[PDB]
């Protein structure tokens, strides 16, 4: 009747995870899997056990894996065996198709499934950018990111020398072209131009207009808001300058653990393997019966 | 190799249909079935081969039903038996459900896939309105048609009396809201107002907002441009005011076609069945390897 989900990892997206699973009248969640167990449990976990292996967790349908990215295929590779399934927001778009045909004999032989890349992007706008193509096979798509925070630049523009804190915002100008924002908190000694053009050195910035500026605290500057503009103009059959677009305004790791339950949900109907979101049909993203669901949306 | 598809009726939608199977290099096009054979056999289809009946047509994969709404269950019990697959772009909002628990049986039974309601709205839009509804499942969805022709709309009001032509026209006003501009031909001897009173009383028109003009030629006034704007403010988990538009600006009849032919390739990869589009893999509408396919949309 219901789904009983485990989150692994409790970090940024675990926490709106929790919210998400607490949300949906068809999950039960288990428990959370951290490194550290119950240790100092957060208030907001309370009401739910905390371990440090998923397998001291109750008979657990699927496995909701809030892990960083380097750490999705080790975890997986580890919870599947157990006959548990896995959904992940697995987001290195280079890497997607090694990921998937690794864990791909894995969950067949194990009868059980694994759906990766499922955020907002990729995820969510996976889907959209495919329907898209769908609608006119010839012509251009564009993504385009932000306003809002990027982890991935955030993180390697703390990693440069005299940057004690720093923050990449990602700007869209238009047909995957971008502008990063980076605000710094200096380490005592260094100067901004010394951390302005050892940032920009940088391939993740070097190619892109970058504005780097010195502020008090960064955590003053931040916010979990986020955007994209998908955007396609092309060819319908041979007819030309069809045009569509499609936009959010959301916070971005609310919509990420949303989504994560909603494959997680999916994973329940699958025959067994390794699954991409384009791969899912979007009905499954649902609770509710088909024909009530096909009632309301078609 | 390539997919042996029939188109039935040479209406607006089948002559786009020929346009975009002529495009799919993943397509054979066997021949178009009309009531009228080869008769009068129109310039563009000089180089195929046009028939009463598609039992004349041979080695056919998939029928494309460019039939009338009325017209689409009676040519698909006829054509599912000789094991060929149907797709149509039925477009009766409220028959889905029943038209789909009709096929179910009757594919399973034959070894064979139809897919139903595959325009752009039933068909693409139901894909994305879907994944909307899942990116935040409580809250508020709006469908919003236009500007563009209304095939509907404007044969309610050729019906009303004194009216010997006429075009309806929607506009969205948002939210779900419609206006309609009628323009009308008044057959001689009628007046604006007796069709107006007349059209208004209609339920097609008594529900939303209508203004009727009298023009000279209805033909001077037509072009199958079209749109909609669909929207979602909702929640996901419960972190409120998520906000998500999906838009286009698109040749309407030259988009059904080419989604059409992208259910026909979909269906070819199906257990036997009948879908509504929101039950098809996204990516099953596009031609390629999975594996180049993800490489390039995820
Ligand atoms: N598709 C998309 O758009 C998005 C996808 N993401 C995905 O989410 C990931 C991280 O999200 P977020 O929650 O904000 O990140 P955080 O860094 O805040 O959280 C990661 C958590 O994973 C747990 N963890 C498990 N194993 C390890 C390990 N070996 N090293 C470190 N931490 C570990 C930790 O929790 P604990 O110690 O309690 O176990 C940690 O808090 C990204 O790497 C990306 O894959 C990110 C944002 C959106
Ligand atoms: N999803 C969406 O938004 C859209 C949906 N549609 C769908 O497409 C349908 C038809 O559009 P379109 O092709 O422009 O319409 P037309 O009226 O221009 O074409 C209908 C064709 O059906 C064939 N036909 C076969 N048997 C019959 C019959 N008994 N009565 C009438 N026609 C018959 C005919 O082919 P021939 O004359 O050669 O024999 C005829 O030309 C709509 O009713 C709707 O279901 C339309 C466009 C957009």
Redesign the interface.
């Known amino acids: 009747k219901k789904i009983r989900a485990a989150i692994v990892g409790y970090g940024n997206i675990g926490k709106?995870?929790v919210?998400?699973v607490?949300?949906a009248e068809d999950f039960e969640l288990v428990g959370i899997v951290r490194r550290q167990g119950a240790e100092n449990k957060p208030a907001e976990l309370a009401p739910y056990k905390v371990v440090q292996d998923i397998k001291e967790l109750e008979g657990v349908d699927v496995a909701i894996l809030a892990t960083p990215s380097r750490s999705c295929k080790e975890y997986a590779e580890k919870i599947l065996p157990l006959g548990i399934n896995t959904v992940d927001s697995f987001d290195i778009?280079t890497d997607?198709?090694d990921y998937?045909?690794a864990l791909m004999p894995l969950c067949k032989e194990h009868h059980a499934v694994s759906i990766i890349?499922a955020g907002?992007d990729?995820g969510?706008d996976?889907?959209?950018?495919?329907?898209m193509?769908?609608?006119?096979?010839?012509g251009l798509s564009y993504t385009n990111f932000g306003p809002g925070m990027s982890m991935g630049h955030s993180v390697c523009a703390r990693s440069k020398k005299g940057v004690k804190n720093a923050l990449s915002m990602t700007i869209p100008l238009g047909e995957g072209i971008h502008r990063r924002m980076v605000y710094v908190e200096l380490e005592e000694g260094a100067t901004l131009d010394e951390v302005t053009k050892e940032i920009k050195a940088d391939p993740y910035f070097a190619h892109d207009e970058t504005h780097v500026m010195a502020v008090d605290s960064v955590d003053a500057v931040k916010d979990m808001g986020h955007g994209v503009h998908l955007v396609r103009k092309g060819?319908?059959?041979?007819?030309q300058n069809?045009?569509?677009?499609?936009?959010?305004?959301?916070?971005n790791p609310?919509?990420t653990?949303?989504?994560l339950?909603?494959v997680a949900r999916a994973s329940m109907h699958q025959q067994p393997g390794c699954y991409?979101?384009?791969?899912?049909?979007?009905?499954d993203?649902?609770?509710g019966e088909?024909?009530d669901?096909?009632?309301a949306?078609?």
């Open positions: 709106f995870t919210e998400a607490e949300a778009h997607i198709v998937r045909s890349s907002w990729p969510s996976s889907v959209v950018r495919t329907l193509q769908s609608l006119a096979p010839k060819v319908s059959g041979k007819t069809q045009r569509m677009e499609f936009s959010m305004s959301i916070n609310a919509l653990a949303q989504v339950v909603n991409t979101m384009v791969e899912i049909p979007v009905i993203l649902l609770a088909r024909e669901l096909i009632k949306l078609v």
